[PDB]
Design a protein around this ligand. Sequence first.
Ligand code: HEM
Ligand code: HEM
Ligand code: HEM
Ligand code: HEM
Lengths: 144, 144, 139, 139
Amino acid sequence: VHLTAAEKSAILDLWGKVNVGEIGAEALGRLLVVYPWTQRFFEKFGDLSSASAIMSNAHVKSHGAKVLASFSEGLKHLQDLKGTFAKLSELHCDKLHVDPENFRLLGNMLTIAIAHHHPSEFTPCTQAAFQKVTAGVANALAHK
Amino acid sequence: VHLTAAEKSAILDLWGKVNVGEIGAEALGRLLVVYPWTQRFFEKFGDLSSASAIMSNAHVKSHGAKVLASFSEGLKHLQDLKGTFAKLSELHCDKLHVDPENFRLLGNMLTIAIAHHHPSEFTPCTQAAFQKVTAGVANALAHK
Amino acid sequence: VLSAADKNNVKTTWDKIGGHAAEYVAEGLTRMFTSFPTTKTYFHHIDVSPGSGDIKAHGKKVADALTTAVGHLDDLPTALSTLSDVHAHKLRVDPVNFKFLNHCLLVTLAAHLGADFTPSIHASLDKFFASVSTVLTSK
Amino acid sequence: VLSAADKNNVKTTWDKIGGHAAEYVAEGLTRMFTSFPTTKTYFHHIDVSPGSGDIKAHGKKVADALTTAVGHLDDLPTALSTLSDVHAHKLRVDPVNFKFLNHCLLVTLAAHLGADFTPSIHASLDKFFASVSTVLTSK
Ligand code: HEM
Ligand code: HEM
Ligand code: HEM
Ligand code: HEM
């Protein structure tokens, strides 16, 4: 992350309008449909064997919301993503063994989720800022 | 990198027998045959349009040797790979724009080169140490 | 590997997009150039600034080749033979660039297609684009 | 996408390896377990220690399926249908694990095949294994 002042405000301007729970449900729900092996990590949630069951599952909505709230939190400490994300890094790396490639797929689902819900606001420039941030969050999660 | 004491000596024990120039020619030569888009980065070397021209090219031998000597150097500063590799990081990242994925492919070619030249010494344990180190070198190169 | 369901989702979505495809692809190119500036390197010879006519013109060539891929889902290596030449022999394009472009394409479709861009439509298109990528980076 | 040259390199190398393939694959599995310990997770139910009979036995099943892939290079999705089921529907294996295994396989062949493991043989085998991977991770 650099993140210039113009980038940070492209990000915050949009974030002020975002519905954390809808985007997070959309993002996590697409990760599991599109990249099916990620289901393995969430079998405690129940049936994930179809798009319809994924999009309807209450634990997916609720977990997607939780994931987005912590992304949201990261956005208020743009200067220290590693410090902010260090406990989640440990959890994901050491307890759960999630290959880092998957962090980047979720960051990408989150970009798609914001383009799908904010058609008019998600301009090439606004997307550019969000790619760095999602890339930063992925790198900070992969740090341990 | 952790690198335990047993890992470091698995690495040094073998390295003491290694021919820097042969391994480096083998490693870089295979990168260009196996992953053909990497040729784009070395067009100043001449014809690279076949395995035969790659394996015969004097600039490939000589550059492969140069790359391995700096890997060799990195091996004597195992505790500070980033510091050791910071100028090469800048060169590769900022001047040449080499996607980091390619650093990892060269690290893998280098593992294959050592298995091909030292059949009997390159045991599963010795390979395990070398994967971390090549992974460390890749990560230190990708740092800028 | 596309299933039979994937193929229908791809054909159905491509036919609905219809005459807009070249528009959507130019916007994909503009998104790739702006979010991953490193990809501009390959396009130094044209004007890559946001609404340029070089981009519309190139958007159209790319749309057309993707239309051809949609018409030959069961044998892409043969339909895309010539494009493999261009991308893997002549330009030596790093495959990381295809991930960038694919993602910018799905981003654009998610924005324009609204409710038709379902999780299943999305999954099928992603496999389609990865499959076109594997061929174009080929030899 | 394998060329016609790639296919001949794959068939020729596989036939030369012959009756050793199961040996080479067990050694591949042992190399994967030791260099990427995270992959042991999928094999918690067997003894994965270095020379175990569970490993030889599993090495053989994997060798056999790769032999079948070599016999059907022109339509892998159909020959490997059942293995796709197992790997993508039942186990939900992260594709990163296939990169690990492929690399451990080439490492083993580079060690045992000596001079027959040329840069061209190497390139063709790598495309072969990536192609088997794409199918096994499929749906
Ligand atoms: C943008 C990157 C990610 C962020 C910000 C994130 C965030 C979180 C958070 C906040 C939790 C809850 C921790 C707690 O309850 O204390 C969590 C748990 C979890 N995460 Fe992630 N995560 C990310 C990526 C991923 C990926 C790619 C995977 C796997 C494919 C994954 C798998 C899991 C699992 C299995 C749990 C525990 C759920 C449970 O059983 O309660 N995460 N993550
Ligand atoms: C293990 C990882 C690598 C190491 C240790 C390494 C090391 C080096 C070294 C020592 C130089 C010479 C710098 C100088 O002359 O001052 C160099 C230059 C260069 N590197 Fe790498 N390199 C690595 C990976 C890669 C990769 C993956 C690529 C591209 C695919 C690449 C492309 C280049 C190019 C084009 C040059 C300049 C050659 C010239 O025109 O003189 N390097 N690298
Ligand atoms: C979905 C992937 C793609 C499709 C369907 C496609 C299609 C095309 C077509 C149809 C051409 C014109 C070929 C001709 O005129 O004979 C072309 C050229 C080119 N492509 Fe692509 N392409 C695709 C992906 C990529 C990517 C990821 C990149 C690079 C970052 C790329 C870089 C280039 C470059 C530099 C040219 C030459 C353009 C010129 O001479 O003006 N393409 N592609
Ligand atoms: C070149 C790739 C592979 C081939 C050709 C292959 C072949 C097989 C075969 C033939 C079986 C037995 C299927 C049956 O008994 O019905 C199997 C099972 C299995 N495979 Fe793979 N496989 C390959 C790659 C992978 C990878 C990268 C992993 C995991 C890190 C993997 C993990 C597993 C697991 C856990 C089982 C079940 C074993 C048991 O029940 O004892 N495979 N594979």
